[PDB]
């Protein structure tokens, strides 16, 4: 059975106006800006952008990849697919 989301989990993350996007739940670095309550820091692969999202917008990667893990015209997307499949836990800083 599912646990709560934790840093390192891989997802497709949904934001208004964008396709479900390869991403991970990030850690918060010591000294870094914390998310609002009930929100997680989401790192989007390919774009390397961070947004704060709640679970309703987070789709676990294993279950979802056969639906959402297909090339997309949008900037950074296909780079994102590579990262999530090939080195999803690397430093992209």
Swiss-Prot record:
Tissues where the protein occurs: Widely expressed. High expression is found in heart, skeletal muscle, ovary and testis. Overexpression is frequently observed in hepatocellular carcinoma samples.
Source domain of life: Eukaryota
Domain PWWP residues, every copy: 7-64
Localization of this protein: Nucleus; Cytoplasm
Record family assignment: Belongs to the HDGF family.
Primary role: Acts as an epigenetic regulator of myogenesis in cooperation with DPF3a (isoform 2 of DPF3/BAF45C). Associates with the BAF complex via its interaction with DPF3a and HDGFL2-DPF3a activate myogenic genes by increasing chromatin accessibility through recruitment of SMARCA4/BRG1/BAF190A (ATPase subunit of the BAF complex) to myogenic gene promoters. Promotes the repair of DNA double-strand breaks (DSBs) through the homologous recombination pathway by facilitating the recruitment of the DNA endonuclease RBBP8 to the DSBs.
Subunit structure: Interacts with HDGF. Interacts with trimethylated 'Lys-36' of histone H3 (H3K36me3). Interacts with trimethylated 'Lys-79' of histone H3 (H3K79me3), but has higher affinity for H3K36me3. Interacts with IWS1. Interacts with H2AX, POGZ, RBBP8 and CBX1. Interacts with histones H3K9me3, H3K27me3 and H3K36me2. Interacts with DPF3a (isoform 2 of DPF3/BAF45C). Interacts with SMARCA4/BRG1/BAF190A, SMARCC1/BAF155 and SMARCD1/BAF60A in a DPF3a-dependent manner.
Record's protein name: Hepatoma-derived growth factor-related protein 2
Shown residues within the full chain: 1 to 93 of 671
């Amino acid at each position: 059975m599912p646990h709560a989301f934790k840093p390192g989990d891989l997802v497709f993350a949904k934001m208004k106006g964008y396709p479900h996007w390869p991403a991970r739940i990030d850690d918060i670095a010591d000294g870094a800006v914390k998310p609002p309550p009930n929100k997680y820091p989401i790192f989007f692969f390919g774009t390397h952008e961070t947004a704060f999202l709640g679970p309703k917008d987070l789709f676990p990667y294993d279950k979802s990849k056969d639906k959402y893990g297909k090339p997309n015209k949008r900037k950074g997307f296909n780079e994102g697919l590579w990262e999530i499949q090939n080195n999803p836990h690397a430093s992209y800083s």
